[PDB]
């Protein structure tokens, strides 16, 4: 796998549908904690982003997401996020399409300007009622009163054990259902409406970029390998090589913050 930028820029100037797949690597450059290995108390994302964790300890899970929600307030998009958003505006005007498909739930791509955004794992700032299924944007801090001054990430912190009745409840008239985060947990499926948008993007894709992904979360991990198999060049921008890198035309190492501003110039 080549480490040559000049060869990349030659495909880049020509490409007309470009898909960018973005992973936790991009958010970690904003100082957003990706709990992917690092921990929230004695747990990582894999232990809490599960339907089982929510069934058995919904209080704990909400504490965790509450933490993550509040932490985002200070945080901002980085040079990698900006470069991708500028590129999409710039290329838009040349009749060229750019789409970002993100594994991230922090919405930093939105804040940066990105319009053609597919959030394959949902968002931190959307809830879903487990009684009626309405999906609602929710930016309220704290999301519910019983969570005010909870969600500390330091281990040893005792569980607030908020009864289920005082965790975020649906506000729809007549419902009262328990809300969950509208995030895709391990063991669950991605939204079918989202999967079709992606299927189409990956099929008619042009040049694929995979940025700050460790390439260990499926299905997102298969998306670029899909494209490469079709004879389409794929550039992997990551600080460190992955289990999929050897299937890609390019690997550029570095912080996506350092490499993308050039690559997408």
């Amino acid at each position: 796998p080549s480490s040559s930028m000049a060869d990349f820029r030659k495909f880049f100037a020509k490409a007309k549908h470009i898909v960018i797949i973005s992973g936790a690597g991009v958010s970690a450059e904003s100082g957003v904690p990706t709990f992917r290995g690092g921990y929230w108390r004695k747990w990582q994302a894999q232990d809490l982003a599960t339907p089982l964790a929510f069934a058995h300890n919904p209080s704990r899970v909400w504490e965790f997401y509450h933490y993550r929600r509040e932490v985002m307030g200070s945080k901002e998009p980085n040079a990698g996020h900006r470069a991708i958003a500028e590129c999409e505006t710039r290329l838009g005007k040349q009749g060229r399409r750019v789409v970002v498909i993100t594994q991230n739930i922090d919405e930093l791509h939105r804040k940066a300007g990105t319009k053609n955004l597919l959030e394959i794992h949902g968002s931190l700032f959307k809830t879903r009622c487990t009684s009626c299924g309405v999906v609602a944007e929710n930016y309220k801090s704290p999301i519910c009163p019983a969570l005010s001054g909870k969600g500390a990430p330091e281990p040893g912190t005792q569980d607030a054990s908020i009864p289920v009745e005082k965790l975020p409840r649906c506000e729809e008239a007549g419902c009262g259902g328990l809300l969950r985060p509208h995030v895709v947990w391990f063991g669950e499926n991605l939204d079918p409406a989202i999967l079709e948008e992606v299927d189409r993007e990956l099929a008619h894709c042009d040049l694929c970029l995979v940025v700050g992904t460790s390439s260990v979360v499926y299905p997102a991990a298969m998306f670029a390998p899909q494209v490469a198999a079709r004879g389409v060049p794929v550039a992997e921008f990551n600080t460190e090589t992955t289990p999929a890198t050897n299937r890609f035309r390019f690997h550029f190492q570095g912080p996506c913050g350092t490499t993308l501003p050039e690559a997408l110039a």
Partner: peptide, 7 residues
Amino acid sequence: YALKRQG
């Protein structure tokens, strides 16, 4: 295919 999973 659609299942979220690690590995």
